[PDB]
Amino acid sequence: SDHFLVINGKNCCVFRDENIAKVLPPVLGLEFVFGLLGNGLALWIFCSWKSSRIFLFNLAVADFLLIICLPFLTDNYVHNWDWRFGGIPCRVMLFMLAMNKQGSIIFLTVVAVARYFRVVHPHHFLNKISNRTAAIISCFLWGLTIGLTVHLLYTNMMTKNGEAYLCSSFSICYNFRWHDAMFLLEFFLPLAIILFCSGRIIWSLRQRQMDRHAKIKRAINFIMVVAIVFIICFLPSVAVRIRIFWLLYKYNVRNCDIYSSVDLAFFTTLSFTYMNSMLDPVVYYFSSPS
Numbered sequence: 665s666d667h668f669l670v671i672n673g674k675n676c677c678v679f680r681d682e683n684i685a686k687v688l689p690p691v692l693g694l695e696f697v698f699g700l701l702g703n704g705l706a707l708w709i710f711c712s713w714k715s716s717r718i719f720l721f722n723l724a725v726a727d728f729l730l731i732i733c734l735p736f737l738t739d740n741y742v743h744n745w746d747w748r749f750g751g752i753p754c755r756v757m758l759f760m761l762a763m764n765k766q767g768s769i770i771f772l773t774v775v776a777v778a779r780y781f782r783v784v785h786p787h788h789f790l791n792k793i794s795n796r797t798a799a800i801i802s803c804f805l806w807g808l809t810i811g812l813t814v815h816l817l818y819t820n821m822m823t824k825n826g827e828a829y830l831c832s833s834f835s836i837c838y839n840f841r842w843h844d845a846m847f848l849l850e851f852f853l854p855l856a857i858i859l860f861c862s863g864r865i866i867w868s869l870r871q872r873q874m875d876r877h878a879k880i881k882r883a884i885n886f887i888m889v890v891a892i893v894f895i896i897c898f899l900p901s902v903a904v905r906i907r908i909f910w911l912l913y914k915y916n917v918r919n920c921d922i923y924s925s926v927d928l929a930f931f932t933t934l935s936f937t938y939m940n941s942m943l944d945p946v947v948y949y950f951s952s953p954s
């Protein structure tokens with residue numbers, strides 16, 4: 665074939681492997697059904713009384729929004745990278761994916777930091793914040809997410825690939841743009857925050873042994889579970905993308921068959937980033953004694 669293509673004037677090349685149409689819908693359908701059956705309940709009932717419930721409600725809202733748009737991704741895949749709905753629709757779909765993932769990560773980090781303050785600084789005033797301030801913080805964080813990701817709606821992403829129509833913010837292009845920096849940061853910065861907060865919480869707890877280990881162990885296990893779930897879900901795609909950037913820097917897009925494998929890898933790992941949203945209800949809400 666001839667994979668070289670021009671997207672927004674930039675020289676990329678995109679590949680169309682039927683393995684993507686074969687393997688991904690198997691994972692995306694399960695992600696959709698489980699995300700619905702978990703997050704719809706987490707929203708029906710918060711996890712509204714406390715700030716932590718508010719933050720978890722926002723996390724569930726982001727996860728719900730992210731999963732409800734996964735059927736359109738499945739459609740794009742089963743047709744082997746053929747969008748049937750037009751430009752504005754997939755502009756919106758990609759914007760939703762990016763904004764909802766970023767919001768979910770932000771609220772994971774907010775919950776982690778709140779736990780850190782609750783366990784390490786019991787008598788800080790953050791532990792006694794009223795619901796109003798939680799609402800204002802949540803609104804400002806949502807506004808930050810939209811302000812960061814609205815350029816997707818601003819810009820064009822639909823391009824004609826031969827006999828097909830390809831919509832995608834992740835074409836292998838000799839163009840390092842703010843979207844990729846955001847994609848890397850959304851992992852590296854909140855990961856650092858989450859791991860630090862967790863390490864301090866587990867260090868502070870292990871200094872006190874006043875005969876209630878039965879439940880403190882459980883809490884430590886759940887903090888570790890959150891950290892490892894985040895890492896396993898999001899690190900693979902970032903790693904593949906960093907390999908992609910090394911390749912782009914050294915081997916520009918001229919013989920770009922060399923990207924063929926890595927490209928597939930990337931789109932087989934993005935799926936994991938969606939799967940986080942179906943795990944989160946089990947990690948955060950369903951673990952509580954309800």
Ligand SMILES: C1c2c(-c3nnn[nH]3)n[nH]c2[C@@H]2C[C@H]12
Nearest residue numbers: 758761762831832833834934
């Ligand atoms: C998924 C995806 C995303 C994305 N961003 N955030 N989550 N998925 N951007 N571009 C594309 C092409 C269709 C795949």
